[PDB]
Enzyme design. Structure first.
Site, mmCIF file in Angstrom:
data_model
loop_
_atom_site.group_PDB
_atom_site.id
_atom_site.type_symbol
_atom_site.label_atom_id
_atom_site.label_comp_id
_atom_site.label_asym_id
_atom_site.label_seq_id
_atom_site.Cartn_x
_atom_site.Cartn_y
_atom_site.Cartn_z
ATOM 1 N N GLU E 204 9.045 4.333 7.809
ATOM 2 C CA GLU E 204 8.127 5.218 8.519
ATOM 3 C C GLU E 204 7.589 6.259 7.540
ATOM 4 O O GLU E 204 8.067 7.391 7.453
ATOM 5 C CB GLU E 204 8.820 5.858 9.715
ATOM 6 C CG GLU E 204 7.897 6.644 10.615
ATOM 7 C CD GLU E 204 7.016 5.750 11.460
ATOM 8 O OE1 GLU E 204 7.451 4.630 11.793
ATOM 9 O OE2 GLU E 204 5.888 6.170 11.796
ATOM 10 N N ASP E 205 6.589 5.842 6.764
ATOM 11 C CA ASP E 205 5.808 6.721 5.893
ATOM 12 C C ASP E 205 6.670 7.450 4.862
ATOM 13 O O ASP E 205 6.282 8.511 4.363
ATOM 14 C CB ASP E 205 5.005 7.732 6.721
ATOM 15 C CG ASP E 205 3.798 8.273 5.977
ATOM 16 O OD1 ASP E 205 3.046 9.076 6.569
ATOM 17 O OD2 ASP E 205 3.593 7.888 4.807
ATOM 18 N N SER E 206 7.837 6.911 4.532
ATOM 19 C CA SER E 206 8.715 7.523 3.546
ATOM 20 C C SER E 206 8.542 6.835 2.193
ATOM 21 O O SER E 206 7.605 6.061 1.981
ATOM 22 C CB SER E 206 10.156 7.492 4.037
ATOM 23 O OG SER E 206 10.283 8.303 5.186
#
Ligand SMILES: [Mg+2]
Ligand SMILES: [Zn+2]
Ligand SMILES: [Zn+2]
Ligand SMILES: [Zn+2]
Lengths: 49, 46, 49, 115, 476, 404, 82, 263, 67, 51
Positions: E204-206
């Site tokens: 998740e967008d990491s």
RNA sequence: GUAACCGGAGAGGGAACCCACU
């Protein structure tokens, strides 16, 4: 701020080349706080006489 | 007790006691930096 | 004497006006610093348009 | 401030065991080998050497959590053959492989130097 | 217009506007009119000439400056009022030529369309290849990317000062950065990113970071915090800097005061931590009570320098600056030049990190699921042009509306250096050694480290301090 | 502990959790749990409350634990789903042409917590033993679950025609006796939709078993992704250069149609639509032509799209993106809208000082015939910035009304 | 109300299940005598769970009807959900 | 059910790198060799920096980090040293550490470059990589000094391997490659024609990739181990092999002890 | 500020290459020729010098704190 | 209706696929500051004494 | 085996505005 009238916040057509279209805070100041384009210069005033 | 300081302008180590106005004995400059400490510093290279 | 007016850095009456980069470095000033701000109580202030 | 020390990845605490052996109750002749302060570097070669043994019915490894420093090796062997002896035979064959590789590499170096 | 173009009586800032269908003709001279320079176009030709370009290219010797260019009657300053009654052309070559006629009556031309951008948005490579909310977010996060914010940051005793160890000018840049002086005070490092799903710690967008690179100094920075204090305020309640002594002063923390020097301050270069006294200040008690300044809890830095001086009231004044380096850990907020922000999810060592046919392991791995909805195609083009530039030896050019460079040309240039033309490479799994079935998109991209570290946000509580009016827990 | 993301909108925002101690200084929560919390890991902060009395600890344990909170009473659907790498990797894993070696099968099965230690008979015994992705997902699926779902790319005529129960495209997910028989698992199978595989699992087996189902899916699929790999690149956004020509032709005929509609309106040859005035009917014709052009270019893009594309590998799985994102990346960004209409005349009867007065053409009112690959001409860039500014403003303004 | 007139559900709702478990494990934590022989587990919450499963919790539930009346349901006497 | 017989031939030997091929071994074994190359090859690097004076414009921890990243020529001393955590002595001795000293002061008006040549070791054979470059090249810069600026420090060098910190990583680039022509097709090219040929590939320009063989197994592992300058590239491989062998032997000893204690 | 000692990605020593790189650029050498004259074959190592800004020179223009 | 509470922590969240949905990773600094009150009993008396 | 020698003291204003984070 915190006003539901989005008309002032919108990017106006007359912002071409004088105000950066991309740069603006994402908070409750969208479109209200706007930076200045690169070659955009603000007149300083002189006498019209 | 000595607490040698450093002048900002002429970089002169000058003796100052406690409760004295911050003054450099030459050049009259009024901003002082303290010193580097004497105690041991150990830094890992990480 | 009326008072003391706060003055903007790199202005035409600021003490850093027209100084060369070597002089600015001698004065512990950044040659790349654009100026245009006031130093009041040792804190930079910028008049938002 | 929560950063673990860099030596935590390979250093056993006082009282820790380098290897732990637990029998697997789900299937017969199966065992779980828990290795502390080791990682893929050892787990992958151990698994690959275990998979060459025809008497090994199951062989695999996992790291439960990369932040943790553990690796679990589950070995299931055919009956009349033990997972423990399978693991030790894999280790003693891998050590022989590495020793032979060392000898051949140093020989290759010697003949490469003006040969 | 003739007078304004020679600056005879009418100055350049004055704008003259003729409304034609409605007979008004207005002249504006007041202050506050926002305007920008535009070229002058006669019949269908610019007044800017090869002679102007030549005599201005040899500047610093002929001193033919922008003021002389304005005086030549080549450019005008046009505000919005005058911009309504004028006809512009984006590019003289593409919009002033014989063809199927569109206007054929131009009056002005733009110097370069990229000048419609601001300062933070002029550092975005290929900003026309991104969705506009991405560009807005990058313009917002460009103010938070840490770097050498000023050259004299060591003399500048300032609170909340952030500088990066190894700033780099971007491998791919716009022609507008040399005027923002971004290549002299950059904020970011040209990281080699691999847009792939490696383990799931970037889902998740990491983002995954290379632990070995961080050890080598990748995005490592130091945090400067400054502490000020001044002695004084009443008839007999005199403030004084000294070492508070237990039998004399009444109120004291459990903090150790031996770190102070006898004048009441710490010498620079002393290791400090949370709840450690920095400025020993006591007020006379009508024995004495201290007002010593304590280091902010969980800071755990080192004193950089200590300055003592006199404020405008002639009282002793002290400011102390404390160094504290911030090694990139997981949770630290990182972002690119396209509004692709993200916190580090895990840090793998070089062995655990995937690698090319060579030993190149990506410094950064981001989730490919961040591209398709965000539509930061500028990010992909930056990652491609960065590899092209780092292989060619040139600095990449990412002017927004260049039209002289595109994905096909960049791909053809990359194919000459022994790489797949679309930037993909065959990475190998760092754990098993098996080559990844899919081919990984990888290349140098200019990532930035933002001020939003996790050590500055993490906090807990278990029956701590209490407010005074209502006995509820404090805030902050 | 009870654990929430502060903008709590529903009771799946404050959810119980079991504490695991981990080295570094960040909160770490499982990726399925991201969806209820609306987390993004883009700098989000979440605050954690520890129940102090043992009574309230037991109360949280029996009421607000996340495995117990899988299915919402809001819309009788599961809230957590397979997301954002695991979903795409499941779509790629449960494809028909996915075969796993003996060592790879053992490695994957080592990550199954609910595994009996019994290796299934491989789908192929000779020439050499190979398993299938469905054969491992069948072990992943708990108990005896029976459900039938359809994949995203399931054709409509397939059910009517033959090959109904033997799918050529391996669509029509069929799970029988807790075993995946056929079908490719997508968002519409393992997501948050009603009647999904996870929903059937929660309704049949326990909440703890469905928790184990999430854990097994994520671990084993993320560990198979170490072998498979999943990316996105600039080559994923390129076309065949015959599709480029087709898109250019579509745009050119659309522009010619808009020009001739403008001609008919100017020569008074355009009859106003009943119920509308001349201005709005001209607007309707222009919008219809532009939308048809954009749809045709998008459809040409998806037709040109390859089997190995990562954009398609994401959108078909439904993990991220939509079918119009590919069109805006490859073929045409589209026509920019402000308040539903085309870009308004900010200047005197024109939009920008680069356009002639009274220019109703597509380029002069916000239509962007360029994609995100060819870049935007400065006019189109400004129009797209102005269009996205509207959505950015709406995002901020809407909150102060919705929360109230 | 009398034992004859019981109109509430015979199923122990989730709220009753949570609160009974909490308030019984709290009693176990204060060294209340356990109603079920334990096999060495030390956590009072698991002890209370075991007692609930064995239907030995020495607690009854007073369900207040809206009109003001109430019913006394013994934990052993009504159906546990899980 | 036994070990396989690997063979190695050297394709290039240089003071900078070693390029060679390993045959008849496992993919996991080859990857673990490549992995020990980066992680578990002990070298000598400085981990304890004490700064007595620092008037430069780079702060103390910056200077310490740049010092620690400086490689040290440890070809045979790393084998005869001991980890500081294992040595019986106090803080530091010559048996587990190497002392470094650095006293540079700029007095002339010309900018003074503080380089690794200015580091004076106590052991003449454990030095930076300024040892021999004859058969002009510069040396590792640490900091530049203005007139009147100086720095004085004393440092110690410990034995460590790349799993602790990247400063103990003896290798710069470890090229790893097996099956250069996609015969096993462990990777899948959507358009194999667009992909450049590998250096070790044996194919004509007409053919893009090798034909698939279902019976194949990964062999012929190609290495290119590039040394940073601390260890010789030829001895990095030997040290990695010895380290992996001793690690396996220690694991076997622990397993044997546990089994004999369980029985 | 100053050139890093090692490349972040590779780890190859780059700290000694900056002055030689500037010297080569003080000639007819282009950047692409100077980089591989210094022996930088990988772009990970090439970018280390290609994109480096040497701010230590701007830092040294300020008078020190002491004398 | 709403107020500050004790025994509460806040920090940045980051993904981790290697723990179940019911588990949450917390730092040792947070876990070493927030406390839970256990009541002594002869069952856990030795463990709590050692603690 | 003394008049514990201080008793570990931590609670540390508040209002206003500004910027920023999700
Ligand atoms: Mg978010
Ligand atoms: Zn002086
Ligand atoms: Zn020793
Ligand atoms: Zn490199």
């Amino acid at each position: 701020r915190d006003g539901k009238l989005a008309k002032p916040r919108q990017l106006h057509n007359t912002l071409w080349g004088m105000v950066c279209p991309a740069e603006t805070p994402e908070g409750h100041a969208v479109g209200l706080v706007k930076n200045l384009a690169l070659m955009a210069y603000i007149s300083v005033g002189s006498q019209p006489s | 007790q000595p607490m040698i300081y450093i002048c900002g302008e002429c970089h002169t180590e000058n003796e100052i006691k406690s409760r004295d106005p911050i003054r450099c004995r030459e050049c009259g400059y009024r901003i002082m930096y303290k010193k580097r400490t004497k105690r041991l510093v150990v830094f890992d290279a990480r | 004497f009326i008072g003391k007016i706060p003055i903007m850095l790199r202005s035409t009456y600021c003490l850093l006006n027209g100084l060369t980069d070597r002089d600015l470095c001698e004065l512990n000033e950044c040659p790349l610093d654009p100026g245009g701000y006031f130093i009041i109580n040792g804190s930079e202030k910028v008049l938002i348009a | 401030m929560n950063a673990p020390p860099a030596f935590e990845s390979f250093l056993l605490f006082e009282g820790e065991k380098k290897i732990t052996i637990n029998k697997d109750t789900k299937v017969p002749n199966a065992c779980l080998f828990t290795i502390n302060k080791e990682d893929h570097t050892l787990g992958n070669i151990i698994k690959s050497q275990l998979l060459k043994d025809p008497q090994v019915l199951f062989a695999g490894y996992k790291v439960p959590h990369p932040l943790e420093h553990k690796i679990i090796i589950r070995v299931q062997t055919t009956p009349d053959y033990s997972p423990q002896e399978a693991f030790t035979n894999a280790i003693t064959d891998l050590i022989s492989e590495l020793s032979l590789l060392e000898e051949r590499f140093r020989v290759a170096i010697k003949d490469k130097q003006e040969g | 217009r003739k007078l304004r173009r020679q600056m005879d009586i009418i100055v350049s800032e004055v704008s003259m506007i003729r409304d034609i269908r409605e007979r008004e003709i207005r002249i504006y001279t007041d202050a506050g009119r926002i305007c920008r320079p535009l070229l002058i176009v006669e019949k269908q030709k610019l007044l800017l000439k090869k002679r102007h370009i030549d005599q201005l290219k040899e500047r610093e010797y002929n001193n033919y400056s922008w003021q002389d260019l304005v005086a030549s009657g080549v450019v005008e300053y046009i505000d919005t009022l005058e911009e309504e009654t004028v006809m512009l052309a984006m590019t003289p070559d593409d919009l002033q030529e014989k063809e199927v006629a569109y206007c054929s009556t131009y009056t002005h031309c733009e110097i370069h369309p990229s000048m419609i951008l601001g300062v933070c948005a002029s550092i975005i490579p290929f900003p026309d290849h991104n969705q506009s909310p991405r560009n807005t977010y990058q313009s917002a996060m460009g103010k938070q990317a840490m770097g050498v914010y000023i050259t004299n940051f060591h003399v500048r005793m300032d609170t909340l000062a952030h500088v990066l160890y190894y700033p780099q000018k971007p491998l791919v840049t716009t022609r507008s950065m040399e005027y923002l002086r971004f290549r002299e005070l950059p904020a970011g490092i040209n990281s080699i990113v691999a847009i792939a799903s490696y383990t799931g710690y970037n889902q998740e967008d990491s983002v995954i970071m290379n632990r070995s690179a961080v050890d080598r100094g990748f995005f490592r920075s130091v945090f400067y915090r400054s502490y000020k204090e001044q002695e004084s305020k009443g008839f007999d309640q005199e403030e004084v800097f000294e070492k508070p002594t237990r039998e004399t002063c009444q109120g004291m923390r459990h903090a150790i005061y031996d770190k102070l020097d006898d004048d009441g301050l710490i010498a620079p270069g002393v290791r400090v931590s949370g709840d450690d006294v920095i400025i020993g200040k006591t007020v006379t008690l009508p024995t004495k009570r201290d007002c010593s300044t304590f280091l902010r809890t969980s800071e755990t830095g080192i004193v950089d320098q200590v300055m003592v001086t006199l404020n405008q009231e002639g009282y002793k004044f002290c400011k102390i600056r404390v160094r504290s380096v911030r090694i990139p850990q997981i949770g630290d907020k990182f972002a690119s030049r396209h509004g692709q922000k993200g916190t580090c999810g895990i840090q793998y060592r070089q062995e655990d990190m995937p690698f090319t046919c060579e030993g190149i392991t990506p410094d950064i791995i981001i989730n490919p699921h961040a591209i398709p909805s965000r539509m930061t195609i500028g990010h992909l083009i930056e990652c491609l042009q960065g590899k092209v530039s780092a292989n060619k030896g040139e600095i990449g050019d990412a002017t927004p509306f260049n039209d002289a460079v595109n994905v096909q040309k960049i791909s053809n240039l990359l194919s000459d250096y022994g790489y797949h033309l679309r930037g993909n490479e065959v990475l190998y799994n760092g754990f098993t050694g098996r080559k990844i079935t899919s081919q990984i998109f990888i290349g140098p991209t200019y990532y930035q480290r933002l001020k939003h570290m996790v050590d500055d946000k993490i906090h807990s509580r278990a029956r701590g301090p209490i407010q005074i009016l209502n006995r509820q827990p404090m805030e902050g | 502990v009870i654990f929430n993301r502060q903008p709590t909108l529903h009771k799946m925002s404050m959810m119980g959790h079991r504490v695991r101690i981990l080295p570094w200084s960040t909160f770490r929560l499982n990726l399925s749990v991201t969806t209820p919390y609306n987390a993004d890991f883009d700098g989000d902060e979440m605050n954690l409350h520890l129940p102090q009395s043992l009574e309230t600890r037991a109360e949280i344990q029996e009421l607000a634990m996340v495995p117990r909170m899988i299915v919402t009473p809001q819309s009788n659907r599961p809230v957590m789903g397979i997301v954002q790498d695991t979903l795409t990797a499941v779509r790629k894993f449960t494809k028909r042409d996915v075969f796993l070696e003996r060592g790879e099968v053992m490695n994957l099965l080592m990550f199954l917590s609910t595994w009996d230690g019994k290796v299934p008979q491989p789908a192929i015994l000779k020439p050499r033993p190979l398993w299938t992705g469905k054969q491992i997902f069948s072990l992943i699926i708990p108990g005896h679950i029976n459900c039938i779902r359809t994949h995203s790319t399931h054709p409509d005529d397939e059910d009517s025609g033959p090959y109904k129960h033997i799918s050529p495209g391996d669509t029509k997910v069929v799970v029988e006796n807790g075993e995946l028989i056929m079908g490719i698992l997508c968002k519409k199978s393992l997501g948050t939709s009603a009647g999904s595989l996870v929903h059937i699992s929660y309704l049949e087996m326990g909440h703890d078993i469905t928790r184990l189902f999430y854990s097994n899916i994520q671990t084993v699929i993320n560990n198979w992704l170490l072998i498979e790999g999943h990316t996105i690149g600039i080559g994923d956004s390129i076309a065949d250069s015959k599709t480029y020509q087709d898109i250019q032709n579509t745009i050119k005929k659309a522009k010619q149609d808009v020009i001739e509609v403008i001609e008919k309106a100017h020569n008074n040859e355009l009859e106003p639509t009943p119920g509308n005035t001349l201005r709005q009917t001209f607007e309707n014709q222009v919008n219809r032509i532009l939308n048809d052009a954009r749809d045709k270019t998008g459809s040409s893009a998806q037709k040109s799209l390859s089997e190995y594309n990562n954009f398609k590998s994401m959108v078909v799985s439904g993990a991220k993106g939509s079918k119009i994102n590919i069109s805006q990346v490859i073929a045409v960004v589209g026509q920019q809208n402000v308040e539903g209409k085309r870009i308004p005349f900010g200047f005197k009867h024109r939009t920008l000082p680069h356009f002639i007065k009274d220019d109703y053409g597509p380029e002069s009112r916000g239509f962007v015939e360029n994609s995100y690959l060819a870049g935007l001409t400065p006019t189109e860039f400004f129009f797209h910035a102005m269009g996205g500014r509207e959505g950015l403003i709406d995002t901020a303004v809407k909150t102060a009304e919705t929360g109230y | 109300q009398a034992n004859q007139k019981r109109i509430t559900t015979p199923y122990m709702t989730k709220y009753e299940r949570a609160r009974v478990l909490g308030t019984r494990a709290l009693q176990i934590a204060m060294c209340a005598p356990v109603m079920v022989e334990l096999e060495g587990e030390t956590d009072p919450l698991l002890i209370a769970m075991k007692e609930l499963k064995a239907r030995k919790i020495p607690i009854i539930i007073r369900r207040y009807l809206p009109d003001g009346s109430y019913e006394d349901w013994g934990v052993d006497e009504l159906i546990i959900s899980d | 059910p036994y070990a396989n017989q690997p063979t190695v031939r050297i394709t290039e030997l240089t003071d900078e790198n070693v390029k060679f091929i390993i045959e008849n071994t496992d993919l996991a074994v080859a990857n673990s060799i490549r992995r020990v190359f980066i992680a578990e090859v002990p070298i000598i690097a400085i981990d304890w920096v004490q700064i007595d004076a620092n008037s430069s414009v780079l702060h103390d921890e910056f200077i310490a980090h740049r010092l620690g990243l400086i490689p040290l020529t440890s070809d045979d001393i790393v084998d005869k040293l001991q980890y500081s955590r294992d040595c019986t002595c106090e803080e530091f001795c010559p048996e587990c550490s190497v002392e470094f000293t650095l006293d540079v002061r700029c007095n002339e008006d010309q900018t003074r470059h503080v380089t690794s040549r200015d580091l004076i070791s106590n052991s003449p054979r454990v030095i930076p990589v300024t040892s021999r470059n004859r058969d002009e090249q510069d040396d590792i810069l640490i900091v530049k000094l203005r007139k009147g600026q100086e720095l004085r420090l004393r440092a110690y060098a410990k034995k460590g391997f790349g799993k602790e910190h990247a400063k103990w990583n003896p290798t710069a680039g470890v090229a790893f490659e097996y099956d250069p022509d996609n015969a096993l097709r462990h990777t899948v090219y959507p358009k194999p024609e667009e992909w450049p040929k590998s250096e070790y590939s044996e194919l004509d320009e007409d053919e893009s990739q090798a034909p698939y063989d279902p019976n194949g197994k990964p062999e012929r592992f190609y290495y290119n181990v590039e040394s940073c300058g601390s260890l010789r590239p030829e001895t990095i491989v030997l040290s990695a092999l010895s380290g992996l062998k001793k690690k396996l032997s220690d694991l076997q000893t622990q397993l044997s002890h546990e089994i004999q204690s369980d029985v | 500020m100053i050139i890093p000692v090692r490349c972040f990605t590779c780890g190859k020593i780059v700290g000694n290459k900056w002055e030689a790189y500037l010297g080569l650029l003080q000639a007819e050498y282009t950047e692409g020729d100077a980089l591989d004259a210094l022996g930088l074959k990988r772009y990970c190592c090439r970018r280390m010098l290609l994109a480096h800004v040497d701010l230590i020179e701007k830092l040294l223009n300020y008078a020190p704190l002491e004398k | 209706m709403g107020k500050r509470v004790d025994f509460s922590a806040r920090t940045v969240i980051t993904p981790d696929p290697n723990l179940s949905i019911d588990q949450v990773g917390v730092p040792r600094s947070i876990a070493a500051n927030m406390t839970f009150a256990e009541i002594v009993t002869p069952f856990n008396i030795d463990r709590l004494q050692e603690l």
